[PDB]
Amino acid sequence: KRGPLAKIWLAAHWDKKLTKAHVFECNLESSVESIISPKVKMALRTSGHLLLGVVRIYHRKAKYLLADCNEAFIKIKMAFRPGILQENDFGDFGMDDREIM
Amino acid sequence: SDEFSHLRPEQRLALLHEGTGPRVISAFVEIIFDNSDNRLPIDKEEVSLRRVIGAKKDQYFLDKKMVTKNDVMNLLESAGFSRSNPYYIVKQGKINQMATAPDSQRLKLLREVAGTRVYDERKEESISLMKETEGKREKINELLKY
Amino acid sequence: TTINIMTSPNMPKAVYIEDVIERVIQYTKFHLQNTLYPQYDPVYRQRVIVMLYNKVCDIVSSLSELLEIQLLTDTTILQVSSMGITPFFVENVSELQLCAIKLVTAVFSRYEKHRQLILEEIFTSLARLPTSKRSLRNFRLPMYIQMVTALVLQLIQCVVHLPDVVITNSYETAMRTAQNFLSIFLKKCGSKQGEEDYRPLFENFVQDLLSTVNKPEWPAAELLLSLLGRLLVHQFSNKSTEMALRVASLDYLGTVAARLRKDAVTSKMDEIQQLQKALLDYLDENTETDPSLVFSRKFYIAQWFRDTTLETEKKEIETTGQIMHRAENRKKFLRSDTVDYDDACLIVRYLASMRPFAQSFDIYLTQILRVLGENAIAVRTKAMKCLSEVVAVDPSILARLDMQRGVHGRLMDNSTSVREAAVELLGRFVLCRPQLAEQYYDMLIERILDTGISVRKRVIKILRDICIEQPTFPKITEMCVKMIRRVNDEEGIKKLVNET
Amino acid sequence: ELKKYSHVNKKALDQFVNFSEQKEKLIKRQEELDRGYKSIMELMNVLEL
């Protein structure tokens, strides 16, 4: 929704609309999580929700970093040194639910 | 209360008026209450919630727009309803057990009364993810050395 | 500098030292990739810009020609190849794109050690293609086609090497190149990868191939189609592969069978040497008009040669006859009116109708029908849908007895998915041909009582379309009675019957 | 002397420049992720209390 913490809301509630463009550099962890702790009138419930949100964000960042690193390492190992009736249900009793009267 | 809808399909089939004439297939229960004090957050004067039930379809209509069975739960949580707690709803002849209950259950009841149950569940869920990112970070350092 | 180095057909040696080569190359690389693409395309990111654009087009064309003339050193070649592969991945650069086609195909022609590098640098960045409806297909041929497919066709046609055994082994190299490229593409395409798919890309590639199947001036397209067919059928037959790849492969085979049969049924319904001569002279004139035709001509030559060899293999009378064929082939190789577009098209159509590809459709059907008895549900569903599409293209194909027994068996099959697929086929066939449906009505209207929710809805939709489309049908009353009979069966079905 | 240096790895220079730049990027990303982890643990302690 709306706010400098909407991303964490989404990551804690819906998580599907959150795109690979959002996750990467939208939120500066060391600043946003720091913002969450002294924020005015924060209920414990919503705080727990936000905790799961920020942890999911961080986990996704880890996933992407691993994927890109693996891609790079696979690249670097390259070089160029030039030197009939088969299965029918038995009759119709399987699927021929009879008409009522 | 969510707890009721944990029954077998037979019970759902048996939870419909089978009195006379034809046999129904689409029962529905609606409740209209007023959050004039804005205890419930969504601003209206008479919030309406109904639960259409059929043999296969189970749906929540909140002011004539469909919902997804989770948004409504978090909404009711925010209102103050505890969707899973037997507390403040006492079935006929089942009050005595709240006194002769073993201690641990009463502690869980009190912990919920404090409003620290959802936080506990979310933290318990988050710990696993944390451990898996630890494994991931180990792998990343390995690959950097390579 | 790049015009002065090239312009004469002949100069003394050492009048152009590799330093100016390297300089102009890196210059175009940096200026292009850092000034042109950002201002011409918002993906990466006044009159002086268009001026520089025109300058770069002239540069790359002249440089292509220069690279064709003399030999060069691989270190320069890596830079040139990277710069020439670059333009295919921004938006509004069409003319630059086809000059880059020229450059890359010259590089692919001369040096037979960088082919793998160009294939990798194409494959790596296939995600970065435009895939926007506007400006997708910008290589004229109405009738536009995609770009990287034109590049692929040009490449595969390029390596022919027309000078004995050279003709044989060169055509073998061509076949190996095509098989390798296509195998890599399809295998990387099928399975669902992380965060991105390839199936729409491959679908567009195959739609393109079908669009350019038999023209006078694009051989090797039928070669790609043949190898594609054989690869697909050897790909989804066995039981070792994954699932989604089998699904996608069977889908592609269905598409190609449809287009093949449809163009067939709507098109057709020493003389060979004279035809070859006429078509070849047409091509010869068009070389003068427009380049790149030389590769096609040499390809036709090599293919006629290998076809004569295969006719030898499959007598002394026909041995001498084919040696006269081969001798005339040698004559025309050594030699290196009034026929125009439609005429040449019909000529190559006939010569193709001699080749062992036009008689493949039959085979294809048989192959699909081997699939229908198998032990995976999704595969049988897709077989049924592809067969349904085939049938609804050419409605006079529900005649062969094997297809009859197939669709009956699958109509009685024990899984609601394939049952609804079969009834959908039969329903579309009945709706298409208004009459001649009085033979399938009984086997159709038996299916209302079929214990799913798919099949019931499908039969009700088909019945509704009948009762709207062609009234005065005899069985109207019974149809109305049965549809009213099912009013209380379910909820969604209830809504459908009520609104109908 | 050419015959001694036959099997040389061409394209080495581009490899070097590009992969060193990308290694720089990856190191910075990893450090940021580490600082974030520390921050998360701090918040978890505050919430528990």
- DSSP secondary structure, B22-56, as one string: S----EEEEEEE--TT--SSS--SSEEEEEEE-SS
Q: Which residue of B has its CA nearest to D34?
A: B137
Grouping H, G, I as helix, E, B as strand and the rest as coil, residue C265 is: helix
Residues 75-134 of C with CB under 8 A from D: 75, 78
**Chain C closest CA to A1's CA: distance in Å?**
24
User: C-alpha D41: how far from its chain's center?
Assistant: 24
For residue B51, report the phi and psi dihedrals to the nearest 5 degrees.
-125, 90
Task: Give, as one character, the DSSP assignment of residue A80.
Answer: B
- Reference C246, options C362, C380, C367; nearest CA is C380
For this entry, resolution in Å reads 3.9
Helix (H) or strand (E) run with residue B59 in it: strand B58-62
d(CA B139, CA C265): 59
What is the pairing mode between strands B58-62 and B47-53?
antiparallel
Q: Within a 13 Å sphere around the CA of B83, how many CA atoms are in the beta-carbon half?
A: 16
Which tokens go with C96? 């630059």
Nearest alpha-carbon partner for C491 in C449, C457, C462: C457
Rounded distance between C-alpha atoms, residue C301 and residue C307, angstroms:
10
The full length of chain D comes to: 49
List the one residue out of C347, C431, C415 whose CA is nearest residue C379.
Answer: C415
Please state the length of chain B: 146
Beta-carbon separation of A97 and C449 below 8 A: yes
Q: Is D14 touching C (CB cutoff 8 A)?
A: yes
- The CB density around residue C107, as the number of other CB atoms within 10 Å, is 23
A42 touches chain D (CB under 8 A): no
Going through C333-459 in order, the beta strands assigned E by DSSP cover: none
Query: How many inter-chain contacts (C to D, CB under 8 Å) are there?
Result: 5
Q: Name which of C235, C250, C192 is nearest C381 in CA terms.
A: C250
Contact: B143, A73; criterion CB under 8 Å: yes
* β-bridge partners, B33: B47
List chain D residues with CB under 8 Å of A44. Answer: 47
Distance CA C250, CA C246 (A): 6
- Burial (CB count within 10 angstroms: exposed 0-12, middle 13-18, buried 19+), residue C328: middle
The pair of three-digit structure tokens given for residue C335, joined into one six-digit string: 């030699």
E-strand stretches of D1-49: none
B140 and D CB contact within 8 Å: yes
Residue of A nearest to C452 (CA): A95
What residues of chain A have any CB closer than 8 angstroms to a CB in chain B? 13, 44-45, 47-49, 51-52, 55-56, 58-59, 62-63, 65-66, 69-70, 73
Question: Residue D13: in which H helix or E strand, if any?
Answer: helix D12-48
Contact B140 D30 (CB under 8 A): yes
Name the residue facing D33 among A37, A61, A75 (closest C-beta): A61
3-state helix, strand, coil in chain B (%, to 5): 40, 15, 45
User: Who's near C296: CB < 8 A, 6+ residues apart?
Assistant: C157, C217, C218, C219, C283
Which chain C residues have a beta carbon less than 8 Å from that of D10? 74-75, 78
| Neighboring chain D residues of C80 at a CB cutoff of 8 Å | none
Whether residue C139 contacts residue C150, with contact meaning beta carbons closer than 8 Å, is answered with yes
B68-97 residues touching A, CB cutoff 8 A: 74, 77-78
Single out the residue of C416, C418, C406, C404 nearest to residue C370, CA to CA. Answer: C406
CA dist A59 and C429 (Å) reads 53
- Which letter does DSSP use for residue A100 in this model? P
Which residue type sits at C196? E
What amino acid occupies position B55? A
Tell me how far apart the alpha carbons of residues C373 and A85 are, in angstroms, rounded to a whole number.
9
A29 inside 8 A of chain D by CB: yes
DSSP tag of C35: I
CA-nearest of B65, B71, B35 to B50 is B65
Contact of A89 with chain C, judged by CB distance below 8 Å, is answered with yes
Method used for this model? cryo-EM
| Distances C499 to B106, C134, C442, C493, C494 between C-alpha atoms, Å | 55, 39, 25, 10, 9
Cβ within 8 Å of residue C1, ≥6 positions away: C20, C24
Residue of C296, C297, C306 lying closest to C277 (CA atoms): C297
Residue in A20, A89, A96 closest to C414 by CB: A89
The conformation of residue A99, written as its DSSP 8-state character, comes to: P
C360 close to C228: Cβ distance less than 8 angstroms: no
Encoded amino acid at B14, one letter:
A
- By C-alpha distance, the chain D residue nearest A30 is D36
Q: Which amino acid is at A63?
A: K
The beta-carbon neighbor of B119 closest among A45, A58, A73 is A45
CB C256 within 8 A of CB C213: no
3-state secondary structure of A14: coil
Q: In the structure encoding, which two tokens stand for residue B146, read together?
A: 């390579």
3-state secondary structure of B60: strand
- Residues C125 and A75 sit within 8 Å (Cβ to Cβ): no
Provide the residue type at C257 as one letter. Answer: A
* Dihedral pair phi/psi, residue B30, rounded to 5°: -120, 145
Separation between Cα atoms, residue C52 and residue B46, nearest integer Å: 68
Alpha-carbon span C415 to C323, nearest angstrom: 60
Dist CA A13 CA B70 (whole Å)? 9
| Dist. CA C75–CA D8, nearest whole Å | 12
CA dist., res. A43 & res. A56, Å (int): 20
Q: Is B142 exposed, middle or buried (0-12, 13-18, 19+ CB in 10 A)?
A: exposed
B 40-69: CB under 8 A from C: 54, 56-57
Helix axes C47-69, C74-85, angle to 10 degrees: 140
Residues of D with CB under 8 A from a CB of B: 23, 26-27, 30, 33-34, 37, 40, 44, 47
Window 321-340 of C, Cβ < 8 Å to D: none
Residue with tokens 């010569």: C351
Three-class DSSP category at A39: coil
| Tokens found for residue C177 | 């190149």
Helix (H) or strand (E) holding B66: strand B65-66
Amino acid at C140: R
| Interface test mutation site (partner B, options A9, A69, A70, A75, max chain B beta carbons within 10 A) | A69
CB-based contact C384:C410 (threshold 8 Å): yes
Per-position DSSP letters for C108-124, written without gaps between them: HHH-TTSHHHHHHHHHT
Q: Is A72 on the interface with D (CB under 8 A)?
A: yes
Q: Does the CA dihedral C347-C351-C354-C359 come out positive or negative?
A: negative
Distance from the D48 Cα atom to the nearest Cα atom in chain A, whole angstroms: 10
Closest-CA distance of chain C to residue D29, Å: 21
Sign of CA dihedral C159, C161, C162, C167: negative
CA distance C104 to C117: 12
Please tell me the distance in Å from B26's CA to the nearest CA on chain C.
9
Residue C445 burial class via C-beta count within 10 angstroms: exposed 0-12, middle 13-18, buried 19 and up: middle
For residue C335, the tally of other CB atoms under 10 A from its CB is 8
Contact C414 A67 (CB under 8 A): no
